[PDB]
Design a protein around this ligand. Structure first.
Ligand SMILES: Nc1nc2c(ncn2[C@@H]2O[C@H](COP(=O)(O)OP(=O)(O)O)[C@@H](O)[C@H]2O)c(=O)[nH]1
Lengths: 280, 322
């Protein structure tokens, strides 16, 4: 599942790649940037194997600059991308939206959606669905957008959802995330809505864990962080680069008993995750 | 009102009251980059796509809604110069599909403004599109409605504007009433009358009886052309000098225009030329509110400065001589 990053020059693809992936199917592989300038596309210039090897195509649109020509070039790209392979998920990111109001952001997203839909109607493409995400480097939005893009390329999503739901239901967990060690891209969660504040807490917990481990090296990552109100934050490294982060509430119980039952349940969950080849 | 809202609008009587009206003007402005798919024939395809989308948005009954090739769009016909020249040129003894004793310059149909079922009511406006078009003459699209939601029509106009902007052109809106009547409706509206510095009918440097026999308002029309304006009233009687086969009547009503109207190609200001050489000048407030004051002041300066107006009139005389 190799995703391809496409966009105009100075839209922010390299900065996005650096911020996300520098700080296979599921691991954060070396993605491919592609500077696409305005030109006439050559018909079948040995690009069929390239687009057939892309799990999902990601397009970047700069909201600061004019984007009508960007949407036109995007439509030209989709015009052969959907023709070569009709199973490619197409994603569009509206980057650099940090200095915009909520109403302006929603209006811009609606205008971009309407323009893309009308241009695809003009080109005669049918049965194609394009997702849109409002992304920015300075906040959590790019992480959530890449999380959705990665989640669209894991065929075992619902089974992981059921497994995490059962784990949370039998361990008094508030919210459990199945992160990855790099890029902080959470892979699976429960049916509960992804709270932004809790996601940022878990991401900074991942950063603190990795940094503190890297400070003392050269002699399986586990971490328990308990707050003042009894709320604990748990960490346990899963198979390959996956890591499990959960927020467990005590509900007026013993701390050590809760830690023991959570450790046993999470070890059982890891043993179950060993059978499924969701890693790497 | 209740009679025409109950579906009894076929009384065919000129009612003294009008419904909500909006007139939209297509102005050729600029080609977009790429989209090669010549800058003089792509706008023809843009008007063709606009007419096709309008006729494809026709309101249809449920019996025709469930069923599944529609008729082709009516042809828009092109010419150069005044409209009366084309009307006189229609005498030729060939064909019958050429502007065919009142001459209906437009045609009317009912549209289906809300296709997705967004509104719980039934949405239906009325459109009128002209059967003639020139690169030097603005295109008229009109919208008559009585009880429709004024937001679905807004995104329909936005869709039409986007479909235009994929090709060239620029769809703009101007007030339905004449420019000379805005003080008598909206006293807060900016409206200035322009008495130009040099009168070409009596200036010794610029005078010829043959020129005024051919084109009486030649210098004023050239001034408006050099300042970037497009003629609005294509069917008026102040510029052309020919005959007609009885009066011409639009699909919406009789044209009650006192003077020729002119539209800036930007879409921001509206000009109007009087009989005695005076010019009217006022901005288009609807475009400004929907989406810029030095251009109209510059045009007023060129119409009031002797040297610049003299230069433009000298250019007009030089083009007339050669
Ligand atoms: N404010 C803001 N600026 C951004 C963002 N992403 C990229 N940029 C700007 O884009 C520039 C770098 O663009 P770059 O990644 O080199 O473009 P590319 O090489 O075509 O992918 C930087 O100067 C940033 O200021 C963002 O999310 N927010």
């Amino acid at each position: 599942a190799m995703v391809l990053l496409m966009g105009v020059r100075r839209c922010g693809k390299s900065s996005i790649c650096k911020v996300v992936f520098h700080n296979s199917t599921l691991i954060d592989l070396a993605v491919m940037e592609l500077p696409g300038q305005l030109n006439y596309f050559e018909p079948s210039y040995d690009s069929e194997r390239l687009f057939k090897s892309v799990g999902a195509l990601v397009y970047v649109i700069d909201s600061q600059d004019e984007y009508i020509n960007a949407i036109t070039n995007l439509a030209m790209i989709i015009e052969y991308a959907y023709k070569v392979n009709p199973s490619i998920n197409i994603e569009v990111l509206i980057h650099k939206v940090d200095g915009l109001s909520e109403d302006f952001k929603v209006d811009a997203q609606r205008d971009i959606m309407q323009r893309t839909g009308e241009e695809l109607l003009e080109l005669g493409l049918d049965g194609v669905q394009v997702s849109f995400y409002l992304t920015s480097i300075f906040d959590h939005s790019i992480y959530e957008a890449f999380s959705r893009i990665v989640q669209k390329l894991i065929p075992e999503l619902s089974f992981l959802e059921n497994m995490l739901d059962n784990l949370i239901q039998h361990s008094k967990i508030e919210k459990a995330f199945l992160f990855d060690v790099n890029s902080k891209i959470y892979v699976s969660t429960d049916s509960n809505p992804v709270d932004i504040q809790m996601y940022e807490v878990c991401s900074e917990f991942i950063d603190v864990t990795i940094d503190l481990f890297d400070l003392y090296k050269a002699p399986e990552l586990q971490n328990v962080s308990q707050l003042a109100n009894g709320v604990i934050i748990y960490l346990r490294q899963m198979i390959r680069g996956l890591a499990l982060v959960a927020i467990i509430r005590p509900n007026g119980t013993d701390m050590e008993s809760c830690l023991t039952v959570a450790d046993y349940n999470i070890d059982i969950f890891k043993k179950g995750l060993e059978d499924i080849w969701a890693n790497a | 009102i209740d009679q025409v809202l109950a579906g009894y609008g076929d009384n065919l009587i000129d009612r003294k009251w009008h419904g909500f009206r909006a007139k939209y003007v297509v102005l050729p402005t600029d080609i977009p980059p790429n989209t090669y798919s010549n800058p003089e024939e792509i706008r023809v395809e843009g008007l063709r796509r606009l007419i096709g989308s309008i006729t494809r948005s026709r309101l249809r009954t449920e019996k025709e809604k469930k069923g599944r090739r529609e008729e082709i769009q009516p042809e828009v016909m092109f010419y150069t110069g005044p409209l009366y020249n084309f009307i006189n040129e229609q005498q030729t003894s060939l064909e019958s599909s050429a502007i065919n004793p009142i001459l209906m310059l437009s045609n009317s149909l009912v549209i289906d403004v809300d296709p997705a079922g967004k509104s719980s009511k039934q949405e239906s406006c009325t459109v009128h599109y002209d059967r003639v078009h020139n690169p030097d003459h603005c295109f008229h699209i009109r919208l008559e409605w009585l009880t429709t939601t004024p937001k679905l029509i807004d995104d329909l106009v936005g869709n039409w504007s986007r479909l235009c902007e994929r090709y060239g052109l620029k769809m703009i809106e101007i007030p339905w009433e004449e420019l000379c009547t805005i003080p008598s409706v909206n006293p807060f509206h900016s409206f200035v009358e322009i008495k130009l510095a040099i009168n070409p009918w009596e200036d010794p440097e610029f005078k010829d009886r043959e020129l005024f026999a051919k084109s009486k308002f030649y210098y004023h029309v050239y001034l408006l052309k050099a300042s970037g304006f497009l003629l609005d009233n294509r069917a008026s009687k102040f510029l052309q000098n020919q005959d007609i086969e009885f009066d011409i009547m639009y699909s919406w009503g009789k044209p009650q225009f006192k003077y020729v109207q002119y539209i800036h190609h930007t879409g921001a200001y509206v000009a109007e030329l009087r009989e005695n050489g005076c010019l009217f000048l006022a901005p288009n407030n609807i475009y400004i509110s929907r989406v810029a004051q030095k251009v109209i002041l510059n045009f007023k300066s060129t119409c009031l400065d002797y040297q610049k107006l003299r230069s433009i009139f000298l250019d007009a005389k030089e083009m007339w001589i050669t």
